[PDB]
């Protein structure tokens, strides 16, 4: 009996080109073909989202029917461009973006338009089962169309149940979408919240033709049947006739930047920073200014100035293994780890996501726990040995082999690489000038500068710090780090034979024996907790606690080491690239008292120190020696000095910790639920909520740590060989990457051969990487030398970098220097070295038996003859069959 | 001017056509490693071991890839439908001069060649986006609305293009006076030459075209008869439309009129149309197209008032393709008829 039903009578019963030809006819559009291809390219600026309805809120909110403010909750966010347009309004203080996601829907995207810090855009959450939360502006945009119109009247009824149950705060205003607003049932549904909460209907002028969507905004104060009746006259006024053509209109734009927010900053001590501010600020005084729009809430902003274009997210692909591997183009994992970033967009976004994080200070009773097991732990290893110094020639010859290769400077002798930069005299002179400063008390040359590299599959697609933010100190203060503290890096001051806890120094080839003789402990399972955001969650009273090694050092050595931990750790400064308007990537300078870096080489001491602390603490809760009634003042120092001086060394006889990682095995199963105190320190876990008890592993042959599950294998002789492993995709996609210094054909050829050797040593047992491996061994010339850097762990020995025949190298590391292998009768054929099992490797991501792998695995000499054309035929090669 | 632009669109459809051919040709294999991983991970019943998370991401980005390839398929749907909608008025306007000046081309043969090759090719390619999910579909994707909505829209698009792309080049004329068409004495030769000017053909069999004469005897006078005492067809093997093109000349055919109004001899109507049983890629569609109004004579003096009749409608008949002419026409302003007879004897001699 209504009018809008004959959309679904005529348009249903008639043909296809009438629907398609009608559907674009006579409707108000906005020109969008640019950013559909422009923001596809990757520019994080443009002041407008890849959405459609931001113009709808432009028309409506500018039209005056809606004036949002304060806190805003979005719903059915999709691409979230509604919220991006909401961000520009000069009353908005927070926006929560909540949407469904999943397959068959539309995931969000992260464009740094204006107002960047103030978004909280969260995917995943389904709002079928969401608790009602307060706001100040409410939005919903979930709309689906049907043939029989009551079917979508049903969905209108559901969503009016969801908002009608939602809006119970009495908030300020709203903007709600209505699917099918031509029922009396909607008028009965509406009139309660009209006599109460008001608003009404406005047809969006820029909607499409063949749908009758109308928005119950909080503005249209009409008698509703006058409005519905009026636009419902415009329904049949805009029903048929001639093909009235398209009207276009200019698109919305605001620009980029980031809106200024409130800050929970702490007043620093300016008398340990300020002269570096006088250095850069008195160096760049004309370019100097104070951005009021600092996106800095837990840190400490102190002005800014302009900056050049630096950094690139254009780290290309190794073409070689690309041209060797057919089916490792089609999978999205090998493309998943292709390109990270150093661009100011990337630095600012990793920064916002998981750096600016205020932590609550834990209680003082926990602090005495820290000082007891800390100072006990120092004096425990202080009983064995004493601090020493180390020297410069150790550091030249140390950086000669591999050490870091991190070539970025700040002072004026900006050169290519460190390995020639060591061959200057003058940096020794200015290093000794900063030794005059720090040895007297001043400081001018301790300034971090990070890069933020995160491991994204496809651009601008939902991931917060998949690889961690990495800070850079300049090399000279890295030497003052080195001489100041780096003896622990050198002479095994937390190795297993000294500290009894951690197996660093050992590579990644013998660790499985260390857990496999952790198998003989009684009681517990493999308890392999992982910690989300390690370096983000280390508080000030951990590194204020760390200075207890000053009780053991030599006197002037205590002045320099205590000095530098005052100068780079107790306080610190970073400068930070930030994109802004017009591409003017204005770089700031920033401060925080409290977190550690990640680039300094003495950080192994602090972290493996720090979690041996926290997990001795967790294991003594796991023996119920401590209780939650022991948080505030004290109960007994004698209970914990007793538990240590009877227990503690014997407990850490049986765990393995490197970096932030841990793997323990207690004698009970109580460890899985010893959790309170730890959350008082605030070291939360991964994939387990805040109080849920943990999960063990009675089996040991797959317990994960340092991204490796370990397998043991048996020979044709019958020889127990523990081998490391990881899922095949995440390594074959590591050889695919090219770093940005491999420009030649020779550099990519030798680096690809470095991956060939590293995989030839450890990862031999799989079927795939062997055929890959000896394949590319035939490709690159025998005459050449593999160089470069495959892994990034400290466990990389650099063993497989030689030009030697690899049978000898396997036979060395995997017969000779094995204590844990007894009968050292040598291998002859690595061809007659057998494999891992079939299905277990298929658990780890193989594709044997598949058609592609079988096909190009039946013709390979041609495939390498491709590259033996592509590189010169004046070389020396080898058979590998 | 016009030809190079429309051939630039034939280049555009070749370009995006082959590019989308590539994108399908990889999405089938991304489907293949997906059904392997699900196939063997599903095998082996001997939590959240990251194989769930990886195969989540494989399904997810396969889903997004299917979305994108359907989106660019829409982007060439709008483009080639604008190609057709602008392609048609050239056909009917060149039809208008083409038998406006019969008083005494292969560009479009090529354009229907490439036109139907691109449409049937995109059809046949679109017929097996099914089998990229008929292994295991198992997702709430755009998978059916795409293949059958867009299958349907391009199905009616090439059925309307097949509906209005079978025309006649050569009108019937005398063998005795090859300069005077539209006039056939009882027993004259049906001097016609048409064409299936869309140059696609199933290579299966040697196809034929049927005539069809005078669908409706009108109100005025359903005229007597004629029986074509010659044949009514020829037969084209597929090797010869590939050789000479799909030419259909039913020339030299002769009639026999049966025996036993103010309009008279040269004022009667007999329009011949032509039944075409056309089928390519299984798409069966029948085609029929009429002719100009032709008069039938019996005597040499009827040539004069027949030809004055021929001008007397061929400049004096809008919406001319119909039955039962001559009834109420307006007379002749000779503003082009003067130039027309000027074409006639000033074509002859001076
Ligand atoms: Zn310094
Ligand atoms: Zn494995």
Coordinates of C-alpha atoms in Angstrom, one line a residue, chain A residues 7 246 441 508 524 550:
Chain A
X7 CA 11.0 -0.1 -6.4
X246 CA 25.0 12.3 -13.6
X441 CA 80.0 15.3 34.6
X508 CA 71.5 -21.9 17.8
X524 CA 56.5 -29.8 35.7
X550 CA 78.5 0.0 40.8

